[PDB]
């Protein structure tokens, strides 16, 4: 009965979703045509002839990145109009994905979201993938989250942001789109998870010994994190943490809901067999201030909640003793209104490896998703990005050109300034 709809929006949303559904089909046994040769109803339905279709709704305004999926090997996997396309892109413009042409794709995407939710008995989360700092993953992502809240009350809407890296961006309007995105990923999102591309670049170099990773290797690390996040939801476990558990043990206030994730048996095939990847070893590497998948050192903040997702042949006494060890560690600082901050979960099914991927077979896993008063430097870093640009009205004549009110930039700035004041006062 348990079931999650994934909604992959944008170029980065689709390309991450290609890695996710590639890993999910290789993990539950579904071939690229749909047939396998009931631990699948969280991500797949059943047509009746042994046929399994993924439960995903792809979105883009370009047709280029989504025509790729319907012409490659995973075309008979998806239902042929799940892959929802437009004609022309918003062109890295938030107002062009919100107040203009992405208003005719929204009524067809919500058409199929309803068709993919009424054929499931009990929905527990709208997993959502976006690329905040762009045109369609920001503009259409903002309008989609507002529309999903008004139509589907409660019904916790997860999100895996692709927030721009602090010191490298590959745009200049990327300060504008991310600050304009805080009016969606703050009051419509519950599970706003912050992922920066630079941090997972550094993970690939320092751990996997890949000095030149491509975006596909970036998405393969993210897909293993989401599989371990839904691991208890699909497989049996000694301690199951479903979505309802997640928004009680990791979110203290409805506004402070921003998390950082760090998987950490992320070991290359050459270096996997020279250490035992024991439970204490993989969680000591999980709390390192370099494996965090946003560029945000937790040592200059204060942890308020941690949700660890030990997965594999992990004995609960080794979970418990490792949590005791990291509690003894002085490098991390838990906030004074938090005697216990260590929601743990155990799933017996070990993490899988894609054949020809960049990871290795590992018996254990840790997915560490935590909230801290260190993410304030992430939003305050693009605070400096915005006010350097908006000081004399850069690139605003092409946001107000298509209908954005001159001034919507300003309360996006006091929306980021509101959460800046909130993170500092929950650490005193």
């Amino acid at each position: 009965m348990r079931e999650v709809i994934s909604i992959h929006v944008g170029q980065a949303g689709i390309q991450i979703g290609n890695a996710c559904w590639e890993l999910f089909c290789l993990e539950h046994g579904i071939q690229p045509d749909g047939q396998m040769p009931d631990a699948f109803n969280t991500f797949f339905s059943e047509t009746g002839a042994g046929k399994h279709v993924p439960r995903c709704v792809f979105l883009d305004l370009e047709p280029t990145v989504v025509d790729e999926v319907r012409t490659g090997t995973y075309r008979h996997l998806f239902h042929p109009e799940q892959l929802i396309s437009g004609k022309e892109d918003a062109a890295n413009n938030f107002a062009r994905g919100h107040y203009t042409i992405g208003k005719e794709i929204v009524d067809l995407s919500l058409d199929r979201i309803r068709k993919l939710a009424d054929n499931c008995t009990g929905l527990q989360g709208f997993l959502m993938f976006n690329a905040v700092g762009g045109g369609t993953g920001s503009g259409l992502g903002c309008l989609l989250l507002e529309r999903l809240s008004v139509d589907y009350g409660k019904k916790s809407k997860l999100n895996f942001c692709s927030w721009p890296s602090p010191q490298v961006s590959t745009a200049v309007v990327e300060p504008y789109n991310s600050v304009l995105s805080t009016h969606s990923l703050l009051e419509h999102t519950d599970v706003a998870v912050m992922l920066d591309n630079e941090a997972i670049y550094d993970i690939c170099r320092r751990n996997l010994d890949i000095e030149r990773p491509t975006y596909t290797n970036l998405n393969r690390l993210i897909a293993q994190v989401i599989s371990s996040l839904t691991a208890s939801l699909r497989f049996d476990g000694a301690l199951n943490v479903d979505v309802t558990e997640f928004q009680t043990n990791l979110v203290p206030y409805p506004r402070i809901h921003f998390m950082l994730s760090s998987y950490a048996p992320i070991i290359s095939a050459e270096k996997a067999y020279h250490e035992q990847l024991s439970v204490a070893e993989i969680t000591n590497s999980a709390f390192e201030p370099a494996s965090m998948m946003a560029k945000c050192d937790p040592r200059h903040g204060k942890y308020m909640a941690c949700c660890l997702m030990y997965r594999g042949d992990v004995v609960p006494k080794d979970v418990n003793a490792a949590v005791a060890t990291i509690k003894t560690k002085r490098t991390i600082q838990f906030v004074d209104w938090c005697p216990t901050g260590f929601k743990c979960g155990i799933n017996y099914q070990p993490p899988t490896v894609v054949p020809g991927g960049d990871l290795a077979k590992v018996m254990r896993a840790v997915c560490m998703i935590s909230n801290s008063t260190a993410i304030a430097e992430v939003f305050s870093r693009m605070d400096h990005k915005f006010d350097l640009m908006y000081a004399k009205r850069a690139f605003v004549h092409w946001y107000v050109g298509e209908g954005m009110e001159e001034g919507e930039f300003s309360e996006a700035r006091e929306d980021l300034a509101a959460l800046e004041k909130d993170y500092e006062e929950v650490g005193i």
């Binding site: 290609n18 590639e22 290789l26 993990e27 046994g29 071939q31 690229p32 040769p37 790729e68 999926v69 490659g72 090997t73 995973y74 491509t214 975006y215 596909t216 899988t352 894609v354 054949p355 020809g356």
Partner: protein, 48 residues
């Protein structure tokens, strides 16, 4: 003028190739400890 051949593969088709499926049929067979014989008597029956 000649015409050069077209060498081109898009990234989705280079690294999303249909992969071999993992080989999974491994049940966890569990034994049952045999029930011990019931050595226990009532005191009334034991002396009376």
């Amino acid at each position: 003028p000649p015409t050069l051949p077209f060498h081109g593969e898009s990234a989705y088709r280079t690294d999303y190739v249909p992969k071999p499926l993992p080989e999974v049929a491994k049940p966890v067979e569990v034994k049952l400890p045999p029930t011990l014989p019931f050595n226990a008597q009532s005191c009334y029956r034991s002396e009376y």
